[PDB]
Design a protein around this nucleic acid. Structure first.
Ligand SMILES: [K+]
Ligand SMILES: [K+]
Ligand SMILES: [K+]
Ligand SMILES: [K+]
Ligand SMILES: [K+]
Ligand SMILES: [K+]
Ligand SMILES: [Mg+2]
Ligand SMILES: [Mg+2]
Ligand SMILES: [Mg+2]
Ligand SMILES: [Mg+2]
Lengths: 107, 150, 52, 203, 141, 173
RNA sequence: GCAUCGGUUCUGGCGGGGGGAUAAAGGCCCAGGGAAUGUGGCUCCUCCGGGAGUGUUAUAGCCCUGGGUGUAAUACCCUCG
RNA sequence: GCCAGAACGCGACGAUACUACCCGCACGUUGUAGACGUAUAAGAAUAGGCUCCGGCCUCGUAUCCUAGCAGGCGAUUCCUCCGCCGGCCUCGAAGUGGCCGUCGGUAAUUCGCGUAUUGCAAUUUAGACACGCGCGGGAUCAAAUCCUUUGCAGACGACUUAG
């Protein structure tokens, strides 16, 4: 019975902040989206919502899981990387962790 | 692409992943849809057009009266009894025990059958369409939403 | 209290230049050239061009 | 691009430096890598030039005490490859240390990683990068001549595992021959119209 | 005297060879410029297979197995078009495996969500018959 | 699309002792007309006693190739400066236009003799009408009869973003 | 969270107008002139696939010079939405 | 060959009291540089190869799997696919796979009942390893240091011995 999964988002990875060679700006992050490899493909995802979910120690209001919400703003480079802004900047220990790219604001 | 009779994919909420049928467009981005309730268990309810993907399949609406849809689309159809139906949950369970289902009102139960009677008949005339509306949508590997036709 | 840009806001353009509406309506930016069969280069302009 | 649980790379025929830079970037992104057959890697240029390079490396050592601080010269083919990767990573940071924890390197193909799929990095393949007529060497030969002791043990073990693979390949060929026969017998049996609908869809 | 040689056998660039370009178009070689560039044109009636007259870099082309016989060197568009249709280049190109692969790829990319559901169900019905036949032959060993 | 050939006609300013001065014409290869005129005064300063402050430009026109679809052989005469002394050369090219021939020449001189654009004078560009006028052996092999050749060891074109292939690529395309 | 607007900015697509050899080419048609990395024929050498002569369109074709369709199309530069 | 032996490198073996050990079950008072279909085993050449021997190769742009209350309860219907156990073989590079049997589940076809109210979105609290706790069953009854002593040893510790 129903040997299928339940996935409605696209996978992504947190790479780093916006930076120069020796200066870094945490207010913006760079995200790699799986499967997109050029600027034209990345134009589809402008404006979507991004979620970063993780675990904590204690329960607050019925759970031990927390979220930080954000959105995609503009492309980056020539190879499909994009920029994003979150409500709070990401913790920077998560360089290499995974995020969820929604489809909420559609067409 | 939002015209009555088109098949929609729901992206969020309780019924995420379900395929429903669009009936009418409301004022400020809201939509009116139905399952139908006897095919996938989704009743008449409102959704926001942002959280929806519109496919390229249309179903016929020759049998629906188009006259009862209008009072379903009235402003206070879904509210104006919510403030009293929500007292049941607090009256027990969270304070006492033994939860029980909230009853469905007679008018909302009756309106569901009236609208969906002719709609199901039209659906049955296209093969595999009934089963398609019964199942749910999900992403496998190698699926790229920026290339998928829908 | 706030400067607004004509070429983006049409109401501001009409405030400063009342002839703007007529210019658009009569399509003064798409006027065609006068009729007439044109002559050809006089066979020595071409000789000098490829001379060397 | 694709996200995997682990990628296993067959090291035969890859250029040492180019494979090293691609592997380093994957680790910093958050991908786990395993490299096998490190003795079959390649280096461009004649062998004599590679030997002179290592000898210059060997001459460097701490003067006042050779047991601390000094460059420690590892000889195995997998440790030569590991050194190249570590130079392209900020290994003195906590982030850099975590990245190196996602890599494994081996000589030969140890039993965990046979019976498994081995990929290839075409941006670093020798037959696709080097102009025909130029010269190259193998890391396995360089390691043998600077003090690596287990060249023949690995050579004998590799022969055994290839002999087992020949038996496995024999069974795999039989299965394909039967499956093709089953599809032929079942095709003209039943499907009156499913065949044409699938053909129109491209399947 | 017995001689047994096993080596490669490539397709040659020559006057009359038909090339395939990046965007599925076709062209015929009329003149050789260098070891890297060629003058070519394709006068085809099908708008998806026709290309203008010009120079093509060989790094962006593939050699098809079709060669027009006795195409004069440096022939103009009128002469090429006559020889193109007399030989039947369009019909010959449709029978190659390269064309069929392209057609199959086009069909799969044009599938809608409803089509994807139906192709899954149709494959299962064919798969059911496959498993029954495979079990029978394997049981008989 | 880097260079075009222009026609430039110039004149000394008319004076009372010489109304109606003589007219001079030159053919200039340049990326645009702003540097076409600057190049004109440079060459005329070296031949006649005229300047830009004592003259004027009469006409500028673009010369287009008459048959940019026919394969031709060209010959070029030039004069250039090395790190010590100046020399004359004669080279040959095979393409479909005069502009294409000059662009190939500029790249060729930079590669083989390290000569910059600022140290080259073009003397003459001539299309060789007869196949007997070909002198350089690297052109003669291209005008041979019944030419044909294969292309061995061709590397297939693979997208950069696709790392981790699952098969060994071939080179027999 | 959504809808309708204001300020700034990044990025896609579509409809017209003008210029130059009133683009240069090019297809089709008319008239004249040439040759070779010489098509068909004719001759000789090998039957062992072919090669070598001869000469100007034939059973392929190519290059120059004028003219018509033609105020043809397209590229490039500028410009109104 | 010869000297040292990583005090955060590894292997084999002996005896293991204190519920320290083994098995089964049920929980979370917990941790993890970061599950969400975490699915894919020939070797070799690249100026050559694969094969069912008919043919085939730019291209993983592939193949497998994928519907049902986060996936119910019945029927029609089918002999496919999956899993826990047990028995035989097999596996040594850092030890794995195959065959058989019982049992449990199972849309390839076609239906009948149930789904609402989470109120127009808010992580889809779902995986795998570790650790802790509580039961119910089994198995087991050990050593080291101080102390006295030796001089093949020694600044003191340590070391070779005996009780
Ligand atoms: K139902
Ligand atoms: K715009
Ligand atoms: K014009
Ligand atoms: K014409
Ligand atoms: K002849
Ligand atoms: K059901
Ligand atoms: Mg705005
Ligand atoms: Mg004209
Ligand atoms: Mg025109
Ligand atoms: Mg030790």
């Amino acid at each position: 019975p129903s040997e299928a999964g339940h996935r409605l988002y696209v996978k992504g990875r947190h790479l780093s902040y916006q930076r120069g060679r020796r200066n870094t700006h945490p207010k913006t992050s760079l995200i790699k989206i799986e499967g997109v490899d050029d600027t034209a493909a990345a134009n589809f995802y402008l404006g979507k919502r991004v979620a970063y979910v993780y675990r904590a120690q204690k329960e607050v209001r019925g759970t031990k899981i927390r979220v930080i919400w954000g959105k995609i703003t503009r492309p980056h480079g020539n190879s499909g990387v994009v920029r994003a802004k979150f409500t709070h900047p990401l913790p920077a220990r998560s360089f290499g962790a995974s995020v969820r790219i929604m489809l909420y604001p559609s067409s | 692409s939002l015209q009555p009779g088109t098949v929609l994919i729901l992206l969020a909420g309780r019924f995420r992943g379900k395929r429903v049928v669009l009936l009418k467009c409301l004022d400020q981005g809201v939509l009116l849809v139905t399952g139908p309730f006897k095919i996938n268990g989704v009743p008449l309810r409102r959704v926001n057009a942002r959280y929806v993907i519109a496919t390229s399949v249309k179903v016929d609406l020759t049998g629906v009266d188009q006259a009862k849809i209008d009072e379903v689309a009235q402003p206070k159809y879904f509210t104006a009894e919510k403030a009293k139906e929500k007292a049941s949950e607090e009256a027990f369970f969270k304070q006492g025990e033994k939860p029980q289902k909230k009853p469905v009102s007679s008018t909302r139960a009756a309106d569901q059958k009236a609208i969906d009677k002719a709609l199901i008949a039209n659906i049955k005339k296209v093969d595999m369409l009934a089963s398609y509306l019964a199942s749910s949508f999900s992403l496998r590997k190698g699926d790229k939403p920026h290339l998928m036709k829908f | 209290v706030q400067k607004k840009n004509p070429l983006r806001n049409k109401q501001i353009m009409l405030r400063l230049n009342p002839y703007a509406s007529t210019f658009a309506k009569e399509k003064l930016g798409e006027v065609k050239a006068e009729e007439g069969k044109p002559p050809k280069v006089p066979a020595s302009f071409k000789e000098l061009l490829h001379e060397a | 691009s694709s996200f995997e649980s682990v990628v296993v790379i067959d090291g035969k025929g890859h250029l040492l430096g180019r494979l090293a830079s691609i592997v380093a970037k994957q680790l910093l992104s958050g991908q786990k890598i395993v490299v096998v057959r490190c003795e079959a890697l390649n280096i461009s240029g004649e062998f004599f030039r590679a030997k002179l390079k290592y000898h210059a490396y060997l001459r460097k050592m701490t003067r006042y005490n050779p047991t601390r601080g000094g460059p420690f010269h590892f000889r195995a083919p997998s440790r030569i490859f590991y050194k190249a990767v570590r130079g392209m990573i900020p290994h003195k940071t906590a982030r850099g240390a975590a990245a190196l924890e996602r890599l494994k390197v081996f000589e030969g193909v140890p039993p965990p990683y046979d019976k498994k799929k081995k990929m290839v990095v075409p941006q670093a393949l020798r037959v696709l990068r080097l102009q025909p007529g130029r010269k190259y060497c193998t890391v396995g030969r360089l390691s043998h001549e600077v003090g690596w002791k287990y060249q023949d043990v690995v050579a004998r073990l590799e022969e055994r595992r290839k002999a087992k693979g020949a038996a496995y390949y024999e069974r795999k060929k039989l299965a394909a021959r039967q499956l093709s026969e089953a599809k032929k017998a079942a095709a003209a049996k039943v499907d009156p119209k499913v065949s044409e609908a699938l053909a129109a869809y491209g399947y | 005297a017995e001689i047994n040689v096993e080596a490669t056998s490539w397709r040659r660039v020559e006057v009359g060879r038909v090339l395939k370009l990046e965007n599925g178009s076709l062209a015929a070689i009329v003149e050789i410029i260098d070891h890297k560039r060629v003058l070519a044109d394709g006068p085809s009636s099908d708008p998806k297979l026709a290309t203008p007259r010009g120079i093509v870099p060989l790094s962006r082309a593939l050699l098809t197995p079709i060669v027009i016989p006795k195409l004069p060197r440096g022939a103009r568009t009128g002469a090429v078009k006559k020889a193109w249709e007399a030989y039947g280049v369009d019909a010959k190109w449709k029978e190659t495996n390269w064309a069929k692969k392209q057609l199959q790829q086009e069909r799969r990319q044009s599938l809608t969500d409803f089509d994807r559901f139906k192709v899954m169900r149709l494959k299962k019905q064919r798969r059911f018959e496959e498993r029954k036949a495979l079990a029978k032959i394997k049981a008989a060993a | 699309g880097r260079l075009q050939e222009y026609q430039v006609i110039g004149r000394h300013l008319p004076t009372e002792a010489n109304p109606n001065p003589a007219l001079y014409r030159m053919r200039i290869f340049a990326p645009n007309e702003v540097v076409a005129k600057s190049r004109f005064w440079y060459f005329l300063r070296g031949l006649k006693k005229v300047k830009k402050a004592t003259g004027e430009i009469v006409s500028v026109n673009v010369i287009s190739e008459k048959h940019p679809l026919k394969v031709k052989n060209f010959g070029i005469w030039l004069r250039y400066d090395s790190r010590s002394g100046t020399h004359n050369m004669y080279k040959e090219y095979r393409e479909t236009s005069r502009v294409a021939a000059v662009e190939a020449m500029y790249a060729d001189m930079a590669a083989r003799h390290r000569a910059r654009f600022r140290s080259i004078h073009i003397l003459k560009v001539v299309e060789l009408e007869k196949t007997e006028d070909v002198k350089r052996p690297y052109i003669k092999q291209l005008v041979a009869k019944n030419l044909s050749f294969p292309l061995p060891h061709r590397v297939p074109k693979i997208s950069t973003k696709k790392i981790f292939s699952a098969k060994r690529p071939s080179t027999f395309s």
